[PDB]
């Protein structure tokens, strides 16, 4: 019985307008950190995740259909589900230099 902090969308949701900022926040966290922000996209998102210590920006969705991490599957109108899947799934299946996952909430919230 453990109440994960990911259950909340604010734990990692930084909103929009935080590219070098959300990246400046990741610079220091531990490998596996991740944050979901937005941008001038048409409504897509970008999850700034720390990989091997070097934070990078990735995309979560591309075409209006859901919030997967690269491929459109199932539905769900929220990222909390996507982030939850990759939260335990490796992200190397696409890159052998990734092997990262959303295991650490960029802003976390295990305090108050």
């Amino acid at each position: 019985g453990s109440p994960i902090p990911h259950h909340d969308e604010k734990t990692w949701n930084v909103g929009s307008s935080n590219r070098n900022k959300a990246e400046n926040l990741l610079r220091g966290k531990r490998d596996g950190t991740f944050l979901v922000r937005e941008s001038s996209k048409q409504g897509c998102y970008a999850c700034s995740v720390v990989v091997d210590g070097e934070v990078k920006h990735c995309v979560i969705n591309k075409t209006a259909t859901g919030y997967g991490f690269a491929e459109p599957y199932n539905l769900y109108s929220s990222l909390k589900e996507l982030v939850l899947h990759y939260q335990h799934t490796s992200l190397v299946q696409h890159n052998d230099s990734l092997n990262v996952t959303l295991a650490y909430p960029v802003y976390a919230q295990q305090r108050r």
């Binding site: 990989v51 990735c58 995309v59 696409h94």
Partner: peptide, 5 residues
Amino acid sequence: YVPML
């Protein structure tokens, strides 16, 4: 922007 699976 890195491509994921």
